[PDB]
Hints:
Layout: E1 37-39, E2 49-55, E3 60-64, E4 75-78
Antiparallel strand pairs: 1-2, 2-3, 3-4
The structure holds magnesium ion (MG) (2 copies).
The structure holds one RNA strand.
Amino acid sequence: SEKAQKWYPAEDEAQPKKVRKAVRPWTPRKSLQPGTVLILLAGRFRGKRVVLLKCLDQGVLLVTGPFKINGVPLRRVNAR
RNA sequence: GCCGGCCUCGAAGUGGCCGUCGGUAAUUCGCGUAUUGCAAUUUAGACACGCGCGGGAUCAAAUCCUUUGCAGACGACUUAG
Ligand SMILES: [Mg+2]
Ligand SMILES: [Mg+2]
């Protein structure tokens, strides 16, 4: 499917050069361990104390305050 | 906290004990919270002020004008109507 294009630009589009910015895993703080009780500083559940379950890829955390203990469900938050 | 008796509070009007009426985890629980989607002021208060509801209360003055001369450049002022 390397056919001729239906349209051609007025002048050749400049391509960007290679960036050399490899993606490397985020390293969470030593205090972010599973089961740690954390206070939510912002968002809908600001001021709520929830339980950390897992650390996600790019500074995101999976937490749940026990929904029957406080009305926080399973939720993603930001480690910051 | 809400309203009611009262009793005392004059440096620029204060607090109280006596009652009503409400709400109230000191302990332990049972249901609800989710979807504001990974943060985005937590629009939440008391000072007002201007209003409209629908009532109570109340039914006033001032100036011009004329007049006086204890006054006066004109205003103003002292009077009287
Ligand atoms: Mg009671
Ligand atoms: Mg004279």
